[PDB]
Amino acid sequence: LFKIRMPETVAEGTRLALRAFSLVVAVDEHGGIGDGRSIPWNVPEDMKFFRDLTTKLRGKNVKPSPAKRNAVVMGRKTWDSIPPKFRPLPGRLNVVLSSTLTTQHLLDGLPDEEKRNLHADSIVAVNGGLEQALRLLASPNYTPSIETVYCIGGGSVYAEALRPPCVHLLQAIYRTTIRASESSCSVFFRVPESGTEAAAGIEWQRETISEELTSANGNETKYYFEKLIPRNREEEQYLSLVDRIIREGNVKHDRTGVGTLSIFGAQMRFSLRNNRLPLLTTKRVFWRGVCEELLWFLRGETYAKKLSDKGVHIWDDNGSRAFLDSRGLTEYEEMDLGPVYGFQWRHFGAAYTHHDANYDGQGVDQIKAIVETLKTNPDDRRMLFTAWNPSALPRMALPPCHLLAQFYVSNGELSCMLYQRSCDMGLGVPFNIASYALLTILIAKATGLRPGELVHTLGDAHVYSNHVEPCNEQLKRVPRAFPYLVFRREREFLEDYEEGDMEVIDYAPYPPISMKMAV
Amino acid sequence: MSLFKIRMPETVAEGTRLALRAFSLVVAVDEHGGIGDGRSIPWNVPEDMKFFRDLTTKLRGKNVKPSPAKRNAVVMGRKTWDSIPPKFRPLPGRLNVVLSSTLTTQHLLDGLPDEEKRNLHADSIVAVNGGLEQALRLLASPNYTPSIETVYCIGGGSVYAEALRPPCVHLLQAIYRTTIRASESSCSVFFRVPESGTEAAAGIEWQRETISEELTSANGNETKYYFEKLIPRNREEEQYLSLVDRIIREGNVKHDRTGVGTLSIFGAQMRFSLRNNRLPLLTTKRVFWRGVCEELLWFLRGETYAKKLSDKGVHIWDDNGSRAFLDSRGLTEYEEMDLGPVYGFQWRHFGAAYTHHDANYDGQGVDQIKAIVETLKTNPDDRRMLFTAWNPSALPRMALPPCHLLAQFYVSNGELSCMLYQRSCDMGLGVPFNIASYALLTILIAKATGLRPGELVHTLGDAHVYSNHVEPCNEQLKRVPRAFPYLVFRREREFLEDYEEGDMEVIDYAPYPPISMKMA
Ligand SMILES: CC1(C)N=C(N)N=C(N)N1c1ccc(Cl)cc1
Ligand SMILES: CC1(C)N=C(N)N=C(N)N1c1ccc(Cl)cc1
């Protein structure tokens, strides 16, 4: 009665259409890959690179299991090129594209039966092209069990990977160039050039390129590596702003001695279409905290212990007996933050006593109101909620930072604008971009709409002084493609969603910033 | 109300006093840029002389002849004044300001042919012991501003040079240059407009608003000549025009329940400088400043009775205050024009229970404006200095929810900046109005807190162009924005709530004329 009931279209608006993937290829100085899939210029260093890349999982501790492993999609001819005795490629799900062969067919091609069953799990045939394979890998059985998908070969498989719609799911291209001169490469590999129609809006850029290396295979073969990624202009908005703040921001010092460089007034835009999730890649975002806290906000929770008991300690400091008493909130039990955030969202203006009270039906439930409006009159220009309540600020452990959000609808897509008065560019902003992206996605799922864009307006945007050096280190990283968000299951009510109901896939953030802590 | 009211500080006027008055420049050059072989001018092109005469003499809005209460001023070097035949001195219908380090105003008078002439022109002549800068400073005084409509620098290689470099060049609103094809007339002093991107231009980008076709003088040598009007590119107004254009070309079309159509985009942001008295009133379409000012003052006093506005000829709330509209909102108990706890009420009495507009609300609710004013004076770096009228609890009781619903302040180097959040923005008439309102508010708050006006950042939520405004808006998009006007205060007050529209004046506002055709 007080909860928000999810429509029957709850799962259809965010169903992953195609799984994201990477492409791995070896070419010669002329762009040629080979004829019917040749390899006579076999460079042991490349084979090992290929093996490590496609087999290893990110979790530097995890070993490939049917529950968590990488996938390799290949054309039939590529599968045939593999010595029958060495099929399938171990430690990976072998997805073979074929319009004649079948899963059993591929299986029997393998000699001994001891493995004709030990690998019955590691092989699957797809009657179609790359797109169908990615569509299949997008199903519950493979996503998220499959950590990363690698398109490994076939001139026709690469060509489909490099054109729409598949290219929009291409996270990276790993190209090895063997400087061996052979003409036995009837087909060439071409990465769409920046700004051309074939590129379909994507700007391919090298993240890395090695120096010229020499093989230890006797031929002294010259070869080098390249990692190409689709330029992420959205994350560059955030980096450009950080750099501008450090270069031109005003330095200020807290009454406690804390310093910051800052600018006033900025705005950034992020797409939420097709399951895209704007989790910054140049520095890992604590997604689990983001998700737990957001759900916490939606349920109009005010007791920080619920978050603390989940390993999310972002409210510890402002939830202690000391801090609370410093605010004159002596009757508040520790971790009881008062009518903050989510409380104003679901109960704007409701009198607060203790987090223990039952606030059902109290105050103005702005979220419920926006949900109903979105479903009946999406063009309404008053669809916004705020936590900024001058009358309740004194009763809060702390005044809200992200205090206002407005929704907008166009062509069945739901867009959201968030206003944040104070923005810690280092830790907070990436976190908050994630929260509202998640919020927008959930609201879309509650209103029969598709997630659109997240607009982020910043007031006082700052970088802490003793964050400058580590921030400069991060500013050196070229943003990678964003990950995607999928839901394992749905719920009857919005307030019933749990962090375990959704999963973030294909998130490959850069390593932690080496903030030389000592030594 | 005294303690209920906001007392202004002793520096109230200090950081708002006009330092230098804006001005235009008119000059004639030969095909090489030379203005004169030294001090003389071997070319008397009749048509140029007339243009100069008309341009510097006329006022805006025809049918208004110059008078000591409203006229333009011409600023010239001493040698230029001397080049004028004593009989035509001073140039009629204009305040003649002469730069001289040796001649006083009386000395200038003594130079007129007779006494009668001196008494008749004593009020139209003034000497200033200094350069153009000192003249612009004097012209910024209460005696001359707003009295003098437009200031025109009219000559002297020395005066032009000073006009074209900082600090004076930042007050130059337009350059009117006449180019004449002089034959073998090699001069010495060259008039050159600083190129875009050069150190000399000081960040200003001079562009042609207009350029005439090549003309032929009726004089004796049929001298060829042409005119140009150059203005400092206004990137700030271009923000607005670019957004409008993008909305028309790419916005989403929508029609409400009434059948009212709009094109819209979601999420935008613009910036406007308020430094050194600059007021961002759009020039490509005249803005109703008196209405902006009366309403803003009305907001600040925490008013809710629209009749106070309509009685002053400001009818922007008539439709939303009518018995019929109030009743459509279920506000049947409200007196007509009593809007309920809207805007200013929430600004000065957030959360207070509302009955009627004539009730006494002193001390009730949270006075957000007063709190911010105090914080700005003692802890300017605080990051919680913002006020809002978006009160979900009171919305049902309002004639309608607020459009500009939140504003945050920021301080840097003694400069006050303000960010405004507007959920719904009518680009055609509403946005220019709003930009001016918050520019005014920021300036007033700056004056009440011992700070200098800084920047106004405007965040737009749903930004739309009405379907009925498309064609006219397209006409407006043709126009190249002109330099913005300025705001000056003719008097100060003891309290913020005491300010009246007549205490301030917009000067040097030169908007384009109404857009051709009607119906929409
Ligand atoms: C080892 C090789 C040639 N090298 C790269 N860079 N990429 C591939 N996809 N390869 C490849 C791997 C397996 C198969 Cl079956 C075919 C080609
Ligand atoms: C008429 C003339 C030559 N023409 C232009 N364009 N500008 C001036 N400033 N002029 C001018 C006017 C008066 C004086 Cl005393 C000197 C020059």
- What does B337-401 look like in DSSP terms, one character per residue? TB--S-HHHHHHHBT-----TTS--TT-SB-HHHHHHHHHHH-TT-S--EEE---TTTGGGSSS-
List the residue whose alpha carbon is closest to atom 10 of ligand 2.
Answer: B27
CA B510 → CA A448, B231, B285, B442, distances in Å? 51, 12, 10, 23
- What does A47-77 look like in DSSP terms, one character per residue? HHHHHHHHH--SSTT---BTTBEEEEEEEHH
Which residue in the set A264, A388, A408 is minimally distant from B266, CB to CB? A408
Which residue in the set A265, A381, A410 is minimally distant from B424, CB to CB? A381
> Distance between CA atoms of B501 and B420, rounded to whole angstroms?
22
> Distance between CA atoms of B120 and B230, rounded to whole angstroms?
36
Strands of the sheet containing A259-271, edge to edge, are: A250-253, A259-271, A450-464, A413-424, A402-410, A384-386
Residue A519 among known ligand-binding residues: no
**Whether A319 contacts A341, CB under 8 Å:** no
Closest-lying ligand 1 atom to the alpha carbon of residue A42: 3
- For A440-507, list the strands marked E by DSSP: 450-464, 484-487, 502-505
Nearest Cα residue to B357 out of B339, B370, B380: B339
Is the bond into A88 cis (omega within 30 degrees of 0)? Answer: yes
Q: Is A159 helix (H, G, I), strand (E, B) or coil?
A: helix
* Beta carbon of A78 within 6 Å of any ligand 1 atom: yes
Contacts of A212 (CB under 8 A, 6+ apart): A179, A222, A223, A224
Strands B261-273 and B386-388, how do they pair? unpaired
Inter-chain touch B421–A422, beta carbons under 8 Å: no
Tell me how many helices (H) and strands (E) chain B has.
14, 19
Which is it for the CA torsion A470, A472, A478, A481, positive or negative?
positive
Contact residues, chain A, for B462 at CB < 8 Å: 381, 406, 408
Q: Which two tokens stand for residue B300?
A: 């600040």
> Distance between CA atoms of A14 and B383, rounded to whole angstroms?
37
Closest-lying ligand 2 atom to the alpha carbon of residue B81: 15
Q: Which residues of A touch B (CB under 8 A)?
A: 250, 252, 255, 264-267, 269, 348-349, 363-364, 366, 379, 381-382, 384-386, 388-391, 399, 404, 406, 408, 410-411, 415, 417, 419, 421-422, 453, 455, 457, 459-460
* Cα dihedral value B284, B289, B292, B293, nearest 10: 150
Tell me how many helices (H) and strands (E) chain A has.
13, 19
Closest-lying ligand 1 atom to the alpha carbon of residue A49: 6
* Cα dihedral value A135, A137, A140, A144, nearest 10: -130
Nearest Cα residue to B407 out of A249, A428, A459: A459
Ligand of minimum distance to the alpha carbon of A72:
1
Residue of B nearest to A462 (CA): B383
Largest separation between any pair of C-alpha atoms in chain A: 82
Residue type, A217: N
Helix residue spans in B11-142 (DSSP H)? 46-57, 78-82, 105-110, 115-121, 132-139
Q: Angle B251-B254-B257 (CA atoms, 0-180°, nearest 5)?
A: 160
Nearest Cα residue to B297 out of B510, B445, B121, B81: B445
* Cα dihedral value B332, B338, B341, B344, nearest 10: 170
Nearest Cα residue to A342 out of A316, A376, A307, A382: A307
CA B313 → CA B295, B306, B321, B472, distances in Å? 11, 11, 15, 26
> Distance between CA atoms of B285 and B278, rounded to whole angstroms?
17
**Whether B263 contacts B492, CB under 8 Å:** no
Q: What are phi and psi of B387, to 5 degrees?
A: -125, 155
CA distance A391 to chain B (A): 7
Q: Catalogue the active-site residues of B.
A: 403
Strands A146-151 and A69-75, how do they pair? parallel
**Whether B425 contacts B464, CB under 8 Å:** yes
Residue A229 among known ligand-binding residues: no
Ligand of minimum distance to the alpha carbon of A52:
1
Which residue in the set A348, A366, A459 is minimally distant from B408, CB to CB? A459
Pocket around ligand 2 at a 6 A CB cut-off = B 26-28, 48-49, 52, 80, 83-84, 154-155, 178
Complete domains list, chain A, with CATH: 1-233 (3.40.430.10), 234-519 (3.30.572.10)
Please give the method by which this entry was determined. X-ray
Nearest Cα residue to B158 out of B139, B130, B125: B130
> Distance between CA atoms of A263 and A255, rounded to whole angstroms?
19
CA distance B399 to chain A (A): 14
Question: 3-state DSSP helix/strand/coil percent for chain B, to nearest 5?
Answer: 30, 25, 45
> Distance between CA atoms of B250 and B253, rounded to whole angstroms?
9
Residue of B nearest to A460 (CA): B383
Q: Which two tokens stand for residue B463?
A: 């930004």
> How many residues would you count in chain B?
520
Residue of A nearest to B252 (CA): A410
Nearest Cα residue to B447 out of B277, B294, B303, B299: B277
Q: Angle A411-A412-A416 (CA atoms, 0-180°, nearest 5)?
A: 95
